[PDB]
């Protein structure tokens, strides 16, 4: 929805804007967070 | 004066008192129970006066409240609201233009705001979502979207069960990503059936053992 | 909960088959393939100390002279699976005069295996491989502890199964020679070891139509085993 | 959740978990179709393939001269109520010299499997059996499901998504009747596409017919006879 | 509280076990009350009628049931139970006839339905079944005897009893009643009963809703008294 | 006493996530590694 | 709540709950109505279809009992199949030991003492049928019967089994049934069916009868289609 | 589920007063 926001509009439907992230410790959630905080092209906040 | 209504908190009751609000122009005033507890000096005692005199104001007044049903039943804030709460709710103009709605979802205590006697008047009940409660969810809120004539809404409703009306706005939501993952110009039904697997997290696969 | 073979679930899945369908996971891999001229059929031994004696602990045990089974999962149960194999043979024998196709045997098998709750304990837990020469030729049929038949062409099981399934599936072809498929399986096995192969590692066997007799190979493995 | 456990007891809304629980039982399988004609009764079984080298598992299996049955869900039940078939079966032909009526065989049916959905210390039949058979009154399709429940139809398909095959047959219900063998046959196996995703057709490898009439015995075809009725149809409108 | 033996039939701590009480206030959920009196040559037993609909039949209601020629029975509490326990004291009945050759005194059978309770409640798995009993006969040398058997397996027989929803009160107005006199005569037991229930029901009764049933020396066959009778008595008593 | 106070501070994320206004394209990530211990105001449509 | 798991005990009040969740299970059935003329019986049952594949003929919800006894199970279909089976052998048995028909009050006093028989073990589930009883005699007139899964039998003149239980009785009440025979019965029941909420929300259903009295020689049986479609006609243009 | 529980504390802000301005402005 950030670079291609003609699909939705297109077909007809609304994009969702929060994604909660779940799974035992260690399977490697952070590490996908890292990732995308590199191809972003945008604004990023860590937050404490 | 004042109506009760409870029921799961599946039922979408904002979407009924919202509707009302909608009908009228009686200058709508809202309000929630838990954020009405501040600073630990009762402050609740004193938004409550304010929206009654607000309300005494703008005399075409509709009352939104929700939430807060707990008062101590085990906070020397929430005793305080009530008491603002009960006495206002019988110093009201017995005339009677000013309107009170209270939508909430326990009856699990019955010390505050007692029924009975003049305090509450009328209350009702909410059902569970029944058979055609789930087909006219879905229906209304696919209407956005490109949808295949021969969506067949009844199998829908029989397999769903224990399972409320927001939960099928998400199926309706499902079905259409889905789709796009495919890039699919319309929806199906199976699109649908794997919506209603998908919001429950399961997964399908061959298990071995059957057929 | 599911602490009861005797219960379904919220989608209507028995949880206690499929504990038992992968307590096979921990066993030890059986290769078997079937060809024109015959059957073939290898396992790893998978010795515990030098001090064992070899001959003790075997995975490949002739219920007739032309049927043979191998064995992957828990021990004890494979041997009351394989008496009651080897007594219904010998009784169709009797009552008929005739030796009975390999089918059948894994029917009357099966048919002992679904008794877990059925009667009036815990199911079995063993994955077994029939291969045998029947009338209408070489036959070879797989089986686990629910009781479901099914016939492979060729076919892997224990651990490792899924490893060796993916390189198994690009070789085989049904014009195959008895003699290439038993190095292909060789190839295979030495792959999916973690020790390096010899001929104390693995024990071969094959029946044939005309050659229905002598289902092992011993000491020639090392001329088998050199040529590869 | 807790009146979720066994068999016996009841909910606060009138209800036992358990048979409702064991009906997704049937939804795990593949899907098969059933139809009768004026003379003839038809059932259309899709085989599901294992691995790339291993035998279809069987779904359509032999009964007697004048029944059969398919198959969908688990593989034990199945086979214990197959043989409590034929041993019924058998058993009326020793005594009477008569071949048995489907009618009454099917109520034996609904007795045997009434038992274990009220005692306690065994699971109910979790399978969507399909029955069809010829007597004296013509052709005949019947179901039952694992609530005891047995209906007659004059067309049903069960399995994993088998609505697709109930509309199909609904939008074509009329004309079932006056048609023969040669085109029933193919009017109803263009049911199973609709099961079927739209990026795979069925094939020769993996699909079964059983056919009953009043003059043929019951007959199955699979792999070598399916040729000549899978010639000739319409392809999906893609 | 704490319930130790809610569920099952164990001793809790102060041995006092906890299902048989249950089953005790189970017999109030019936909602009726019976009376029975004797007299030196009689024996009455007196009881009301509920009919909350005018599709109910007249004749499928009465809860007096014949046990035998000589023993009468009247039933509280629920209804099914009560149905199988008059079918098994029938039962009992029968073979103590067969097997003995002269008839069965009113003790015996009581004993029998005790015995059976008893053996019930001792082992698990079966509801001890909520009815009471009570039973009347003429026997000789005794004269009239009314006994009343418990669903814990206690009987006993005595001058007047009451059953159901107001025991407490009807139980006392007899103590009160009984003390100055006996009851001598046959028309001053019917008295005492109806008098009874009316006063602890505060209400007077239509006939059509009153269930008498008396044995007498001069006649020990059972018999059921009919509306006219019974409007007859009513109004002698009720001048 | 003290506790109470971290209570308001996650009821002013709440009603700030959403209401009206849509907030565009400014899109949240949660993660945890206990999700049962989550207080179901959460994951109501519209915030997650 | 605790205490209302099992069937063999009882709460802190003194009820048992299962027997009344099976009650309350009941009640989602199809209404089916009896009703008695001074010369017959007359039983009427509302049956609802299901998707269009149906032959009509499937889930009869009338059983041939007996010679001259009806059937009304209303309920879970099962269960009442396996009572239909037990009273049919019950009479059977009567019939072998002394050789003549069984009397009505007999029979349903036996059915229901067997049913009330799954009230008390715990290892067995109380049934979830509660159906009529039906039956004309030369020599005993018109009678009818009810039972419930609780173990209660005794007659009526007229009942109803369903949602609108006490709605159809409403106004099956203002009928002087006393003096009229079953002919005029036969086409007023039908409206009677189709007064309470037969298709307000509903896809379609089909009304069956039967027919017992005086007119059959005490014999029990469905009523023929020409009078059926009679009934149709009158109470379909009555409902205008 | 008994209590035997503890907690922690919030400080007591209300701590300024007000202080003669000693600006020398001409
Ligand atoms: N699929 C994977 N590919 C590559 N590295 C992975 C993968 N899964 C886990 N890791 C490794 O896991 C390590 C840390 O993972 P990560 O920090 O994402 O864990 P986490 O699930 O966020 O844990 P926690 O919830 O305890 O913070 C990294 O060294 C990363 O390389
Ligand atoms: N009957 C209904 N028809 C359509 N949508 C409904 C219905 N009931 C609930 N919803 C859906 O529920 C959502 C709004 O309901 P909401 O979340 O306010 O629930 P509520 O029960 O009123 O809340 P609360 O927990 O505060 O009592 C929307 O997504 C709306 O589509
Ligand atoms: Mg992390």
Known sequence: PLLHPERFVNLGIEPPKGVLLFGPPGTGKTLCARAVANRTDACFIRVI | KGVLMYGPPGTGKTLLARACAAQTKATFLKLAGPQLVQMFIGDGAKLVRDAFALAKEKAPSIIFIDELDAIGTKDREVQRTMLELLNQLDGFQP?????????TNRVDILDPALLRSGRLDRKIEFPMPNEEARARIMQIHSRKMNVSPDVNYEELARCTDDFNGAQCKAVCVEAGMIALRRGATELTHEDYMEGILEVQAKKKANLQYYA | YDRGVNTFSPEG?????????????????????????????????????????????????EIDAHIGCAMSGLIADAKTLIDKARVETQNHWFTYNETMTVESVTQAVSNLALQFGEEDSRPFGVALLFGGVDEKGPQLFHMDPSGTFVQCDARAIGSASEGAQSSLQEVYHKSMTLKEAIKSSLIILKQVMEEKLNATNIELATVQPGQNFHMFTKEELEEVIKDI | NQYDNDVTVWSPQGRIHQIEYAMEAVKQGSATVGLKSKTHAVLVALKRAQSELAAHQKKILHVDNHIGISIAGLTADARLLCNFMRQECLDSRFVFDRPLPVSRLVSLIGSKTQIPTQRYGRRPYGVGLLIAGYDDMGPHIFQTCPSANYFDCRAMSIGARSQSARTYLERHMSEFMECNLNELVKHGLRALR????????????????????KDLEFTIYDDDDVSPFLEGLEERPQ | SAGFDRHITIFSPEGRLYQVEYAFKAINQGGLTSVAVRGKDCAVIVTQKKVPDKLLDSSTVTH??????????????????????????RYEA??????????????????????????????????????????????????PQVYKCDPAGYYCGFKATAAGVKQTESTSFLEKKVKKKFDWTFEQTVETAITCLSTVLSIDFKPSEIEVGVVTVENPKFRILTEAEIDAHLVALAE | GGDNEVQRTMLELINQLDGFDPRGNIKVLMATNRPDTLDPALMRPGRL | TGYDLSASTFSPDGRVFQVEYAMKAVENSSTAIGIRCKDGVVFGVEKLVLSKLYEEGSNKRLFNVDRHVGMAVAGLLADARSLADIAREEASNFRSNFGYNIPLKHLADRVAMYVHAYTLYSAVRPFGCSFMLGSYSVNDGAQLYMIDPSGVSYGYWGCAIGKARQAAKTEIEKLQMKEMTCRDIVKEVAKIIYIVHDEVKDKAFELELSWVGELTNGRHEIVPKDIREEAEKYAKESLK | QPSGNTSSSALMQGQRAPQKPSQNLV
């Open chain 2, 95 to 103: 005339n009677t233009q000013v309107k009170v709605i209270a939508a």
């Open chain 3, 13 to 61: 899945r028995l949880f206690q088959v499929e504990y038992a369908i992968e307590a096979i996971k921990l066993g030890s891999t059986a290769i078997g393939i079937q060809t024109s001229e015959g059957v073939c059929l290898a396992v790893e031994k998978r010795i515990t100390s030098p001090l064992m004696e070899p001959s003790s602990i075997e995975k490949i045990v």
């Open chain 4, 194 to 213: 609709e099961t079927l995703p739209a990026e795979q057709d069925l094939t020769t490898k993996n699909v079964s017919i059983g056919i009953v009439g």
């Open chain 5, 64 to 89: 007096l049931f014949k046990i035998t020629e000589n023993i009468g029975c009247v039933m509280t509490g629920m209804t099914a139970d009560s149905r199988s326990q008059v079918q098994r004291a």
């Open chain 5, 94 to 143: 029968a073979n103590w006839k067969y097997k003995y050759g002269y008839e069965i005194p009113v003790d015996m059978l009581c004993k029998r339905i005790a015995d059976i309770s008893q053996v019930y409640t001792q082992n698990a798995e079966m509801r001890p079944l909520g009815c009471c009993m009570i039973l009347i006969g003429i026997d000789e040398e005794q004269g």
